[PDB]
């Protein structure tokens, strides 16, 4: 052993589950809402299903300039009206 | 007789906290419709 409490002890203790029957569902719900509120899309810049193309566009918004790439992506996004 | 907040504790939670958050997210994703 190396001094820490056995995991067997911990996970079969009442207190552990009093704590984690709150903390685990809390986290799960947090992640759930991170998706359902749509915040994930905006944090990571991922297209929603209606934001891959403008209505009659069929050309991928591929980044083609290294140093003005940021502005390219921004223009691409404005192009979705 | 035993400590609570150890190097092991930290390690464990650095993995487990985000894992449960993420699993919540992916769960939510299963109900996204185009």
């Amino acid at each position: 052993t190396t001094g820490e409490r056995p995991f067997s002890d911990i996970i079969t203790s009442v207190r552990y589950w009093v704590i984690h029957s709150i903390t685990i569902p809390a986290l799960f719900i947090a992640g759930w809402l991170f998706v359902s509120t749509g915040l994930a899309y905006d944090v990571f810049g991922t297209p929603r299903p209606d934001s891959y193309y403008a209505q009659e566009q069929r050309s991928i918004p591929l980044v083609t300039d290294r140093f003005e790439a940021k502005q390219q992506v921004e223009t691409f996004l404005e192009q979705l009206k | 007789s035993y400590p609570i907040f150890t190097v092991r504790w930290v390690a464990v939670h650095t993995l487990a906290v985000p894992t449960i958050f993420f699993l919540g997210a992916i769960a939510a994703m299963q109900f996204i419709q185009r």
């Binding site: 207190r15 009093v18 704590i19 709150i22 903390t23 809390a26 986290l27 719900i29 947090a30 809402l33 991170f34 509120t37 749509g38 915040l39 | 400590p3 609570i4 907040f5 958050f21």
Partner: peptide, 30 residues
Amino acid sequence: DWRVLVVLLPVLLAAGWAVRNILPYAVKQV
């Protein structure tokens, strides 16, 4: 952004709860 608070309210409620429950043993340890 209200979404970050609606989303990170569960996380901070969890942190607060477990802090509340483990506070005496944490003080005893520290």
